[PDB]
């Protein structure tokens, strides 16, 4: 539930900064370590955010340029997000933690900029984006929440757990 652009932007920033801050103490040498019962490495964790946040921005970019938007992505389907994630890991996994963090910070700033340029109705009322219709009656802000606030929260838990369990 969000009432304003300011409220949404502030919640994204709050959850994003707590998430990113967890990577400060992680060694580059350990970025690919798979730890027991933790589904992703630090590098995979970041690549997942880079994937969805950039995909969100790309949906909007395609639609306002007048293009059809295949969601989640061309060649990928909602019933096979695992394959989509694999494309994320492959795409962003060739970069360091430092590099992935910088990219993600830039992508989140683009989200701030996007929210600012939306009209109130475009952000908060359904029926304004074709790409948002992918889930019936969801306004854009919901799509933004579930790809920023929500995963920055959940995957902060995952990366903290990774740090609790990673071997010396
Ligand atoms: Cl994980
Ligand atoms: K990895």
Author numbering: 3 to 170
Show me the paper's own sentences about this structure.
The precursor PdDfsB is cleaved by subtilisin to yield biologically active Slf, and the chemical gradients of both proteins between two growing colonies could be accurately modelled. However, remarkably, the dfsB gene is widely distributed across Gram-positive and to some extent Gram-negative bacterial kingdoms (PFAM entry DUF1706). The most strongly conserved region of PdDfsB is the C-terminal helix, which is present within the mature Slf sequence.
An intriguing question is whether yeast secretes a processed form of IRC4, analogous to Slf, which goes on to control the population of co-cultured Lactobacillus species. We were able to express, purify and obtain crystal structures for DfsB homologues from Clostridium difficile 630 and Escherichia coli UTI89, as well as of IRC4 from S. cerevisiae. The overall structures of CdDfsB, EcDfsB and IRC4 are identical with that of PdDfsB, with strong conservation of overall topology and surface charge, particularly in the C-terminal helix.
